[PDB]
């Protein structure tokens, strides 16, 4: 009985696989970028990469090729997930409607098997006879491709060889024919064998085991024309054929290691190769040709060709265009050209993505001081490292503050005909209008005539011919610009008003009531036209000349009171088309039609806060599909702002909300604000690129950050950053840091770089005497970093072989001072595992860095936290309690002894603390006895952790090795001295991403309970929380139900993928819930909804508002 | 060390 739900925030950034090849049609290029679960497909254009399709997965992508056998019209894609769930896919588009149908799909795991050497690798014979699989040392998996085998039924070869380094088939071969280095202990050598698939068994390969090197590690298949194999190793490059051997030993490969490669041209002339430096190589092969005999081969050289990301996935597009897929940082669009500009780099970057790659540690600051919390992250690794702050929301700035209880509209306005700048608002008013001249950025509020001031103001537009519009509760009013007063007035024939008010530039449209006239604001007059009278009271009407009309505007829509309704009508006919017809007794307070690419768009607002979204026809007039949201309760004013290239819609609920555009779709991210009223686009001499916006009482103005659901700021640290504190008092972060040098011909070391270390502002190094007793090191700092500005302020260095490990930001003891303190250790390659390092007590001043204190130690201070006002500490094996003297150093108090290697610690506000590398979590106790250490329970199963937290008094999540999560609680039971001593996994879950870090923190606000974030090596931000035995209940039933409607891709069972594993052993899930899959309900249709229901109470769309109000836990 | 070992699962792979 645990309840935790658990909920992707960010999906993952990092990018595991990338493929190319035409999927989407036999003409057309795409890349297949593999995230973790998540494939994108993309078609490659001029611009880049048009995005069409980002399907989700159960499974991790641990192999993905697209391939092609006879017969098929196009592209097929076979997907090895890592709980060796295989499957193949077929792009398939309705039309409209986009799938990614699964043709075929089994798992393939095997009972036998220890998974192997170089993990999986699945690979696919040329002529598309089969896959080869080597999921496990000793086997050889072989998936026959047939027009059946659509449950990819496969057997095993044995294979003598117990240790393969990397496989691929042969172009040009009679026989399937696989190709592998592999390692015995003489060294390592390159076989071959046939596949013989009549048999089940192997075929002497064309030609005989030869050497390959020590470090041979990539295997590549030159195709066809000219046939063979490539070898790479460190510091040399190979060519295999039956008799034939090239092979270059090029110096500037030593340097570091080859890594990815891509075939560049379809031949094999060329291709590329990534280092772990994010260096970028050309290998070209020479090719040679005699009168009539198939091309040989001369030789083969490299080509520095410049810099990418580090680089995991290398894919050659277009025409000079590569994709670079990178998880120790940004993936980034990159453009080879025949030139080297300044630096003699041949490489240019087009495009970089953010992926905040690895998430090593990370802390929540609400760092302007809001209720928000924004996230920083340390993120990536050598070169690429960086912090991410990232922002929920798209926020304003705010400057001017003029509150009025009132402003019951506002429209811009150019006092003069020209400048795009406007320097009044005249704004409707609680029952008058106000008008705003402005000196600049200065207020003022004077008359203007033909304009009232003592009848309210329903619009003021920009109508054209030199000329300033006012319709007011009676009459549509005007004003010229050369004239300026009096030119024309309209008025109802029976002294009645105008109810809903509406005009573009050109039109003029009212309604008082049922009753639709129709006028134009002609050269100095405002003339009459149509007139028709509807069901019922006009609630809201909107117009405005969209694409393929200037100013005068064609079709049209409107919602009306009693049938709660919109229907959609023409012009000076008013000819009714189609219609909706919404419920509830609530009117649709807004209606609109607007446009952003290829589709023409319609919106309408009730009052009840909530929305129903449409898409309209500049042509025809029907009805799109239909969903229902629900901004802010209060009814939503929708309107259009000026942004960029796609200007888009604000909607101002008590809950203001930016619809953007996603796929060519519409984004839906909160706006960072109180509570919008009214809004519209600005842009004066003193408020330019403005926006205004009306509250309860205050008019503001600003521009508006990117879009995203999430915003992220980064900083470039060019080393990899570790750990990270923000203290507060000092309006500052700690940045544990770490950077690599060589070896000098002075024996030192030098740099590769400069680092965010080496160009600190001011700094330090370690003097501290504590101890005595090409090639790489690591050195490390404290970094000292602005929270405002992100600037590296100071930067400490540490000793010669000394990494900080661990960082805190507290006060200690009676001290009324807040440290930084910095557990580290020494190490060296030689040594297991150190036996010596030091906590270090650090204080940051008016710029000042000063070592307050030192204390040796016989280990790694793995972790710290503070306990209260005592520095609790794991030291390599011991959990170590100290003591802050007021002398001022750091003395020992106590130490629990019980633990293979204490990893990580917590500690719950009280005196108890949780962790452990290997087997699993103990949980302890201080105890204000003899201030000794008494160890509470342990969990006794065999968890590799990497990262703990504490839920609450009871619950212990815990993560770990093998990607799951699991939650303890302590054995409530008698006999309380063997089922007290041992505290259950009550809750077990298979994330399938591997977390780093666990904290408290939120990134929402100013049904669940807590909220705890994790950070993961795949740049997902996930979140858990807590439930009630009966929301988990609701939810778990949701779940089972929300899956027999699901189709899953590659037809995964939800459950299968949900479960915990590790190798041994594999439970289901208990106690946990994606909400990821909760979500996944506002995805489907009413009817596929519906059935989701059958059976306190039992409702139909109560759910689909259960749901919502959890969306916004972040 | 097991340190050029956490620090390295640290990243990935």
Redesign the interface.
């Given at each position: 009985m645990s309840y935790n739900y658990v909920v992707t925030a960010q999906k993952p950034t990092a990018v595991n696989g990338c493929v190319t090849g035409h999927f989407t049609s036999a003409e057309d290029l795409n890349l297949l970028i593999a995230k973790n679960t998540r494939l994108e497909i993309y078609v490659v254009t001029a611009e880049g990469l048009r995005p069409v399709k980002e399907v989700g997965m159960y499974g991790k992508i641990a192999v993905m090729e697209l391939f092609r056998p006879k017969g098929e019209s196009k592209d097929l894609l076979f997907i090895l997930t890592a709980k060796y769930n295989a499957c193949i896919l077929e792009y398939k588009q309705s039309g409209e409607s986009i799938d990614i149908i699964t043709r075929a799909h089994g798992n393939v795991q095997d009972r036998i098997g220890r998974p192997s050497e170089t993990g999986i690798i699945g690979i696919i014979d040329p002529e598309c006879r089969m896959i080869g699989l080597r999921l496990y040392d000793g086997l050889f998996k072989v998936i026959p491709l047939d027009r059946d085998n659509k449950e990819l039924k496969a057997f095993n070869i044995r294979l003598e060889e117990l240790h393969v380094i990397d496989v691929k088939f042969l172009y040009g071969c009679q026989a399937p024919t696989i190709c592998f280095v592999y390692q015995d202990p003489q060294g390592r050598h390159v076989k071959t064998y046939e596949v013989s698939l009549r048999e089940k068994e192997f075929n002497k390969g064309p030609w005989k085991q030869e050497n390959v090197e020590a470090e041979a590690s990539m295997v590549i298949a030159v195709p066809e024309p000219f046939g063979g194999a490539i070898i790479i190793g460190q510091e040399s490059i190979t060519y295999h054929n039956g008799d034939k051997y090239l092979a270059i030993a090029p110096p500037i490969i030593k340097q570091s290691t080859i890594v990815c490669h891509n075939r560049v041209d379809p031949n094999g002339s060329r291709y590329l190769l990534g280092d772990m430096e994010g260096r970028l190589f050309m290998l070209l092969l020479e090719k040679e040709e005699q009168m009539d005999g198939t091309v040989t081969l001369k030789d083969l050289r490299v080509e520095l060709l410049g810099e990418t990301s580090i680089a995991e996935c290398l894919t050659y597009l277009d025409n000079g265009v590569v994709f670079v897929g990178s998880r120790l940082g940004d993936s980034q669009l990159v453009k080879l050209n025949v030139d080297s500009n300044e630096q003699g780099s041949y490489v240019v970057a087009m495009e970089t993505f953010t992926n905040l790659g690895p998430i090593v540690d990370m802390c929540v600051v609400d760092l302007e001081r809001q209720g928000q919390g924004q996230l920083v992250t340390c993120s990536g690794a050598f070169k690429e490292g960086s912090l991410r702050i990232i922002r929920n929301g798209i926020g304003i700035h705010e400057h001017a503050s003029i509150d009025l209880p009132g402003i019951k509209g506002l429209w811009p306005l150019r006092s003069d005909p020209n400048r795009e700048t406007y320097d009044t608002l005249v704004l409707s008013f609680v029952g008058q209008t106000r008008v705003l001249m402005l000196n600049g950025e200065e207020v003022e509020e004077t008359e203007l005539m033909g304009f009232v001031d003592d009848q309210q103001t329903f619009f003021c537009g920009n109508v054209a011919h030199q000329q300033l519009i006012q319709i007011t509760s009676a009459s549509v009013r005007l004003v010229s610009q050369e004239p300026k007063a009096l030119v024309s007035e309209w008025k109802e024939p029976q002294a009645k008003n105008i109810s809903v008010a509406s005009c573009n530039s050109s039109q003029v449209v009212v309604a008082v009531g049922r009753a639709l006239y129709y006028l134009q604001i002609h050269p100095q007059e405002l003339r009459q036209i149509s007139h028709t009278e509807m069901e019922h009271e006009v609630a809201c009407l909107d117009i405005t000349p969209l694409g393929d009309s200037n100013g005068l505007s064609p079709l049209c829509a409107i919602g009306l009171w009693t049938d709660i309704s919109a229907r959609i009508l023409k012009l000076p006919s008013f000819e009714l088309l189609h219609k909706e017809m919404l419920g509830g007794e609530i009117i649709p307070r807004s209606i609109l039609m607007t446009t952003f690419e290829s589709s023409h768009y319609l919106l309408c607002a009730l009052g009840d806060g909530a929305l129903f979204y449409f898409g309209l026809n500049i042509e025809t007039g029907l009805l799109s599909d239909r969903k229902k949201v629900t901004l802010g309760t209060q009814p939503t004013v929708l309107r259009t702002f000026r942004s960029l290239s796609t200007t888009n819609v604000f909607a101002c609920s008590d809950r203001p909300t930016v619809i953007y555009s996603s796929n060519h779709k519409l984004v839906f991210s909160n706006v960072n604000l109180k509570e919008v009223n009214y809004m519209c686009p600005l842009n004066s001499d003193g408020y330019p690129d403005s926006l205004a916006l009306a509250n309860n009482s205050t008019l503001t103005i600003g521009t508006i950050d990117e879009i995203q659901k999430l915003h992220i700021r980064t900083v470039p640290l060019y080393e990899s950053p570790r750990k990270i504190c923000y203290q507060e008092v000092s309006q500052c972060f700690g940045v544990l840091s770490s950077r690599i040098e060589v070896q000098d011909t002075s024996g030192g070391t030098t740099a590769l770089r400069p680092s965010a270390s080496t160009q600190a502002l001011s700094s330090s190094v370690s003097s501290s005497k504590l101890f005595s007793s090409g090639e790489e090191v690591e050195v490390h700092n404290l970094l000292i970093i602005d929270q405002h500005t992100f600037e590296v302020l100071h930067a400490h260095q540490f000793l010669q072989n000394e990494y900080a490990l661990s960082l805190v930001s507290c006060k200690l003891g009676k001290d009324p001072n807040t440290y930084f303190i910095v557990g580290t250790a020494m190490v060296y390659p030689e040594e297991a595992e150190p036996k010596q390092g030091r906590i270090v007590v650090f204080q940051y001043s008016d710029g000042k860095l000063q070592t307050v204190a030192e204390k040796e130690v016989k280990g790694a201070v793995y972790s710290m936290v503070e306990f209260n006002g005592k520095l609790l500490a794991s030291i390599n094996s011991t959990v170590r309690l100290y003591e802050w003297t007021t002398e001022k150093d750091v003395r020992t108090e106590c130490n629990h002894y019980n633990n293979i290697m204490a990893l990580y610690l917590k500690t719950k506000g009280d005196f108890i603390l949780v962790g452990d590398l290997m087997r699993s979590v103990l949980l302890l106790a201080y105890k204000p006895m003899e201030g000794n250490f008494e160890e509470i329970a342990r969990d006794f199963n065999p968890n590799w952790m990497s990262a703990v937290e504490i839920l609450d008094d009871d619950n212990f999540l815990g993560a770990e090795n093998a990607f799951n999560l699991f939650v303890c609680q302590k054995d409530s039971a008698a006999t309380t001295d063997e089922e007290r001593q041992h505290l259950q996994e009550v809750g077990l879950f298979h994330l399938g991403e591997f977390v780093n870090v666990f904290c408290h923190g939120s990134l929402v606000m100013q049904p669940t309970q807590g909220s705890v974030l994790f950070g993961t090596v795949n740049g997902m931000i996930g979140l858990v929380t807590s439930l009630s035995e009966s929301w988990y209940n609701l939810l778990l039933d949701m779940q089972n139900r929300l899956n027999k409607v699901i189709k899953s891709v590659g037809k995964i069972e939800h459950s299968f993928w949900r479960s915990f594993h590790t190798e041994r052993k594999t439970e289901p899930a208990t106690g946990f819930i994606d909400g990821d899959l909760i979500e996944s309900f506002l995805d489907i249709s009413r009817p596929k909804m519906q059935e989701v229901v059958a059976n306190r109470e039992a409702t139909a769309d109560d759910l689909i508002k259960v749901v919502e109000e959890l969306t916004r836990i972040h | 060390?097991?340190?050029?070992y956490?620090?390295n699962?640290?990243?990935?792979l």
């Open positions: - | 060390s097991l340190v050029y956490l620090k699962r640290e990243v990935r």
